[PDB]
């Protein structure tokens, strides 16, 4: 439970930018397994994460740190890597939002405080 | 090994 | 070039820790797919990465921004992701690194 | 990449 310069940045400023993203559409709420017809989804993904828990924890202080946050950013695209076939277009659509968010975390405030 | 989410 | 405080941490730091990690050799490397018996490799992974070449990279101060650098990190783990079974230790391997590189991206200095 | 066959590769080896 804190509040600090960077997780204020990754909620504000990265979270910002990829939750609006014309991919984002599939990573803003959990996998619905059932509704996609993915009977297979949690036998092979054990932690599943989408960016509307990542937000949620932000706005709820759950994080004490950004490296905290930054590894839920990262379960979630590496499951998608991992379940997906290599030709599915999430895949491509979760790198693209990757490279967003490694682009943002290299300007990420460095005083890490509060 | 996947049964994924499709393309296309 | 006088190299940018992020690109000597990500030397100096990020490589520094992965290169020698105990997980790390199968990264060290180009993938050998004649060696390992992967006849579909190139077929489903178009941009090969490994540490090797990074590091080369790094040494030679071949990027210009520290972002381009972790690009690179990135494509090489999931390249491992899309490629491999999701049972394969070489996954777990991976994901295993990244957290570190994450971990250390954290506390890389500001740009500029 | 990754791109070209949908499935999932074949593997370095599992446990």
């Given at each position: 439970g804190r509040v600090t310069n960077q997780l204020q940045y990754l909620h504000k400023v990265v979270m910002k930018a990829l939750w609006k993203?014309?991919?984002?559409?599939?990573?803003?709420?959990?996998?619905?397994?059932?509704?996609?017809?993915?009977?297979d989804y949690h036998k092979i993904?054990?932690?599943?994460?989408?960016?509307?828990?990542?937000?949620?924890?932000?706005?709820?202080?759950?994080?004490?740190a950004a490296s905290e946050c930054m590894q839920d950013?990262?379960?979630?695209?590496?499951?998608?890597?991992?379940?997906?076939?290599?030709?599915?277009?999430?895949?491509?659509?979760?790198?693209?939002?990757?490279?967003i968010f490694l682009q943002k975390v290299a300007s990420m405030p460095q005083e890490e405080q509060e | 090994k996947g049964l994924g989410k499709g393309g296309a």
């Open positions: 993203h014309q991919f984002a559409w599939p990573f803003r709420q959990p996998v619905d397994a059932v509704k996609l017809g993915l009977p993904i054990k932690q599943p994460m989408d960016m509307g828990t990542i937000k949620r924890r932000l706005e709820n202080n759950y994080y004490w950013f990262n379960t979630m695209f590496t499951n998608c890597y991992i379940y997906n076939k290599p030709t599915d277009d999430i895949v491509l659509m979760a790198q693209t939002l990757e490279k | -």
